[PDB]
Amino acid sequence: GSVIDPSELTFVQEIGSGLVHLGYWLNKDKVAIKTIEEDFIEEAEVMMKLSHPKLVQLYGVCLEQAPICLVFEFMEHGCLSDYLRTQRGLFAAETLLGMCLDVCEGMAYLEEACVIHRDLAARNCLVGENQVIKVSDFGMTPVKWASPEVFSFSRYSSKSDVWSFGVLMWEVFSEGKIPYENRSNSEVVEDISTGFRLYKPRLASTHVYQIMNHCWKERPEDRPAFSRLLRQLAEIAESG
Ligand SMILES: C=CC(=O)N1CC[C@H](Nc2nc(CN3CCOCC3)cc(Nc3nc4cccnc4s3)n2)C1
């Protein structure tokens, strides 16, 4: 990846913190500049060699002076979680399914590359023009998105990502509701262990909910891989 000198960046507006700015690179390209080390930089290098239409891209990294930063392409509509919330009531069900399909295409690519996301959730996906969804923050090596084998034993895998993808589906079809709202981490773990699952969102069809539930099977071996999920989702986009 290209290294970027901080003099090449113009910071126009802070858009996020707890530090992201809209800015320009070379007074030309709009960029999202994320301000903070070896870990942060390593994620950038991993992502700069993973090229898929549904995965966010980087222009480069800025190593000039601390705080260091990453320079990403600017996704015009922000994170998926906020976007679902601010546009509540304006989505057709097909648009919502299309969003899940976008994410799943990206995850199927990561799965094939043996890359485990570990923190898949609507807040880690971004929305571009024409409501295209890209997966973000996928270069790393919250109990509400965690599978049981993750919250009890730290056993991360693509199938644990599949569990998180079911929860993300629930966030999309519920248009940005918070899962297990007001329930404590302790409460979530207990509810899940006794077989509880998130309720069917009203914009979700019976078939969509079945797929959510296949993603939340107790045993990771019982969950479908993303490459299979992708086709299941696509099948339903015609009839279901
Ligand atoms: C949970 C939200 C979060 O972490 N955010 C970081 C910045 C992001 N906000 C944001 N806002 C915009 C512009 N608004 C969108 C809604 O309409 C009003 C304008 C854009 C934007 N774009 C980003 N692109 C990237 C690329 C890589 C990494 N982060 C981003 S944020 N983000 C929120």
Which domain CATH number covers 43? Answer: 3.30.200.20
- Report whether residue 138 contacts ligand 1, using a CB cutoff of 6 Å: no
Question: Whose structure tokens read 């807040």?
Answer: 123
69: β partners? 35, 62
Query: Do 151 and 72 have their domain in common?
Result: no
Phi, psi of 11 (to 5 degrees): -95, 115
Alpha-carbon radius of gyration of the chain: 18
Q: Which atom of ligand 1 is nearest to the CA of 137?
A: 28
Task: Tell me how far apart the alpha carbons of residues 44 and 84 are, in angstroms, rounded to a whole number.
Answer: 27
Query: Do 146 and 27 have their domain in common?
Result: no
Query: Do 154 and 67 have their domain in common?
Result: no
Cis peptide bond prior to 67, omega within 30° of 0: yes
Contacts of 202 (CB under 8 A, 6+ apart): none
Which domain CATH number covers 129? Answer: 1.10.510.10
Q: How far is CA 103 from CA 76, 107, 131, 132, in A?
A: 17, 6, 12, 9
Task: Tell me how far apart the alpha carbons of residues 29 and 214 are, in angstroms, rounded to a whole number.
Answer: 42
Task: Tell me how far apart the alpha carbons of residues 31 and 8 are, in angstroms, rounded to a whole number.
Answer: 12
Nearest residue by C-alpha to atom 10 in ligand 1 = 78
Evaluate whether 70 touches 15 at the Cβ level (below 8 Å): no
Evaluate whether 67 touches 86 at the Cβ level (below 8 Å): no
Q: Which atom of ligand 1 is nearest to the CA of 81?
A: 1
Contacts of 103 (CB under 8 A, 6+ apart): 54, 125, 133, 135, 165, 168
- What residues form the annotated binding site for ATP? 15-20, 34
Evaluate whether 167 touches 150 at the Cβ level (below 8 Å): no
Q: Which domain holds residue 18?
A: 1-76
Task: Tell me how far apart the alpha carbons of residues 240 and 238 are, in angstroms, rounded to a whole number.
Answer: 7
Residue 92 has which token pair?
């057709």
- For residue 76, the CA-to-ligand 1 centroid distance in Å is 7
Residue 230 has which token pair?
């992708």
Domain limit, last residue, from 59, 76, 93: 76
Closest CA to 212 of 167, 173, 172: 167
Resolution given for this structure, in angstroms: 2.2
Give the DSSP per-residue string, 110-143: HHHTT---S--SGGGEEE-GGG-EEE-------G
